[PDB]
């Protein structure tokens with residue numbers, strides 16, 4: 446059922462998820478687990494939602510995928526205090542993805558597609 450872009454995005458998503466072994470970013474954050482969340486965070490995102498979007502072929506480019514990844518991390522760093530596991534893990538994931546999906550890495554990949 447898959448396409449080349451879907452396989453590349455599944456690769457990036459798997460590598461990001463390895464950083465979150467307990468699955469704190471695996472499913473949506475609800476108001477039950479996080480008080481007032483829907484008041485503070487306008488556009489929720491999580492790794493499960495991203496996987497579903499890849500499978501449905503909703504992402505046209507690495508840029509569109511990268512935007513959801515950063516949104517997920519940015520929501521966590523805005524809602525949670527800096528002394529929490531959620532804030533610190535989000536900062537770790539953000540750094541990982543910026544390295545993995547840099548313009549330099551994407552250029553090397555594009556050169557290998559010749």
Ligand SMILES: CC(=O)c1cc(-c2ccccn2)c2ncccn12
Nearest residue numbers: 469470474478479520521524525531
């Ligand atoms: C990602 C996130 O911000 C998050 C995940 C969780 C979470 C999700 C499931 C089980 C345990 N923790 C959470 N709890 C309180 C405040 C914030 N969070």
